[PDB]
A paper describes a structure:
Whereas mice only express CD1d, humans express a functionally diverse family of CD1 antigen presenting molecules, namely CD1a, CD1b, [name], and CD1d. Here we focus on mycoketides, a class of mycobacterial lipids presented by [name]. Certain T cell responses to MPM require both a phosphate and a β-linked mannose unit, which protrude from the ligand binding groove of [name]. To determine the mechanism of epitope display, we determined binary crystal structures of [name]-MPM-1, -MPM-2, and MPM-3 at 1.7, 2.0, and 2.1 Å, respectively.
The synthetic mycoketide lipid moiety was used here to generate three new MPM analogs with predicted chemical stability. These synthetic analogs comprise a carba-mannose, where the ring oxygen is replaced by a methylene group (MPM-1), and two C-mannosides, where the anomeric oxygen is replaced by a methylene group or a difluoro methylene moiety (MPM-2 and MPM-3, respectively). The lipid tails and phosphate of all three MPM analogs were anchored to the [name] protein. Despite this, the mannose headgroup of all three MPM analogs showed considerable conformational flexibility. The phosphate group was sandwiched between a hydrophobic cluster including Leu69 and Phe72 of the α1 helix and Val155 and Thr158 of the α2 helix. The phosphate was unable to establish stabilizing interactions with [name], except for hydrogen bond formation with the Thr158 Oγ atom. This was observed in the MPM-1 and MPM-2 structures, which accounted for its reorientation within this region. We also observed a considerable movement of the [name] α1 helix in the [name]-MPM-1 and [name]-MPM-2 structures compared with the [name]-MPM-3 and native [name]-MPM structures, with up to 2.1 Å difference at Leu74 Cα, which appears to be ligand-induced. MPM-2 and MPM-3 did not give rise to any detectable PM in either the stock solutions or the cell extracts. For MPM-2, we could not detect formation of PM, and the likely mechanism of recognition by DN6 is cross-reactive recognition of the intact compound. Therefore, we tested response of the CD8-1 T cell line to the stabilized MPM analogs. Both MPM-2 and MPM-3 elicited a response similar to nature-identical MPM, indicating that the chemical modification did not influence recognition by the TCR.
Residue numbers in the entry:
A (entry chain B): 1 to 104
B (entry chain A): 6 to 281
Write the structure that this text describes.
């Protein structure tokens, strides 16, 4: 007590071009407490081979994590960042808009 | 200018018999060290992460950190008795130092409880945060009287060992911490801002260091609607920034995105919107 709700931002490291190797990032920030589930998704399924930064926190003591995975976009493929946390009733899926990204 | 080295810890107490402890070392925003909990050892993340320290000094510190993690967890689990309505709870520690141009170093040791300031270390004394009442004062009493050798060790680490280490760590990593990394940019269309309106997006990614300038342009005329987002982290030490522009129907042709960054030095990136 108290508890703060994760903010979820999804963006690519390089221009989203089908068939080109790229990196998908999910930056999850501003949450408390640290217990959290963050997963990168391809077509609904957790991406098993991902990287994440070690847990860190801001001056206000809220935590942040950076997730990233190498991925090759295609036209059919859908990418997302899913986050569960005590402040969240349902897991929250933020879908990766290829053109815009998904920031707040 | 000032540079910070932070050793942070996170202790998550789930119940009377299960806690977990995490920890890392950060040079400003760049993680330089991890902690391996199953072997209780330092993870050196860069080839230069040992700074100018010998393996002997680092082994000493490693043993000190593992003793610290275990003994802090144990004393907290002891003193949290059978009050299992108080679980789960979470303790954060941020300790370290800052080098300053022209000033003496700063050393700090700050503790949070459930995300609120609890207490800090002030030269010789554990000081309860005014905004955390009874518990803070209680913990500080114990820290000030029961654990005095721990306290002189802490003083020495944050005021003497930490800046010495940080100086050697900057020097060992000098070819990296002062790097200049050029960004790339690309354009895309964004969600509709409204009927008869379009949103253009200029993505700038892969720059270091963090200061950056981005504007939408028509020729040499900067555009009023330019809006920059947050500077967001990439992996491998670069950053990302989105700059959008809302434009009325039938006016996107001729717009460009212009990027200035220290790494370009008089080679602004200029990207023309090609459609639409
Ligand atoms: C954990 C995250 C890791 C991240 C990786 C980071 C890796 C990098 C490389 C770090 C290097 C950077 C560094 C140079 C900068 C350091 C700055 C900052 C860390 C300050 C933090 C101070 C520490 C955490 C608090 C522990 C002090 C207590 C524990 C004192 C206890 C000892 O004191 P003591 O000797 O008196 C007890 C003795 O106990 C014996 C047995 O019973 C008795 O025999 C004996 O007589 C005594 O009683
Ligand atoms: C053996 C040395 C290892 C390093 C650890 C030294 C620090 C030990 C910290 C001790 C934890 C203190 C918990 C205090 C809880 C308490 O006793 O206060 C309860 C109040 O709520 C009652 O007013
Ligand atoms: C404490 O929590 C751990 C982690 O979930 C669990 O394995 C263990 O059974 C718990 N201990 C209890 C409830 O006594
Ligand atoms: C709920 C039990 C108390 C939790 C807060 C203890 C913080 C101790 C920090 C000491 C640092 C060496």
């Amino acid at each position: 007590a108290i508890q703060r709700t994760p903010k979820i931002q999804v963006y690519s490291r390089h221009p989203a071009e089908n068939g080109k190797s790229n990196f998908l990032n999910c930056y999850v920030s501003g949450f408390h407490p640290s217990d959290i589930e963050v997963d990168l998704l391809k077509n609904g399924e957790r991406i098993e081979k991902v990287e994440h930064s070690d847990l860190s926190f801001s001056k206000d003591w809220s935590f942040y994590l950076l997730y990233y995975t190498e991925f090759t976009p295609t036209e059919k493929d859908e990418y997302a960042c899913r986050v569960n946390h005590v402040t969240l009733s349902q897991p929250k899926i933020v879908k990766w808009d290829r053109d815009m990204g998904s920031l707040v | 200018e000032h540079v910070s080295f932070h050793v942070i810890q996170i202790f998550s107490f789930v119940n009377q018999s299960w806690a977990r402890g995490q920890g890392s070392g950060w040079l400003d925003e760049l993680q330089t060290h991890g902690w391996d909990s199953e072997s209780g050892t330092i993870i050196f993340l860069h080839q230069w992460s040992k700074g100018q320290f010998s393996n002997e000094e680092l082994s000493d510190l490693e043993l000190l950190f593992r003793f610290y993690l275990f003994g802090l967890t144990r004393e907290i689990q002891d003193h949290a008795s059978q009050d299992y309505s108080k679980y789960p709870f979470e303790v954060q520690v941020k300790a370290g130092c800052e080098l300053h141009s022209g000033g003496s170093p700063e050393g700090f040791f700050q503790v949070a409880f459930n995300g609120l300031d609890l207490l800090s270390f002030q030269q010789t004394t554990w000081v309860p945060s005014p905004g955390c009442g009874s518990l803070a004062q209680s913990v500080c009493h114990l820290l000030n009287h029961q654990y005095e050798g721990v306290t002189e060790t802490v003083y020495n680490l944050i005021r003497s060992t930490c800046p010495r280490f940080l100086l050697g760590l900057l020097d060992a990593g000098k070819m990296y911490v002062h790097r200049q990394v050029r960004p790339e940019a690309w354009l895309s269309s964004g969600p509709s801002p409204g009927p008869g309106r379009l949103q253009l997006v200029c993505h700038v990614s892969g720059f270091y260091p963090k200061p950056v300038w981005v504007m939408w342009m028509r020729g040499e005329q900067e555009q009023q609607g330019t809006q920059l987002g947050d500077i967001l982290p990439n992996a491998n030490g670069t950053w990302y920034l989105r700059a959008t522009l809302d434009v009325a129907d039938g006016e996107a042709a001729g717009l460009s995105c212009r990027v200035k960054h220290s790494s370009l030095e008089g080679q602004d990136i200029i990207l023309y919107w090609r459609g639409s």
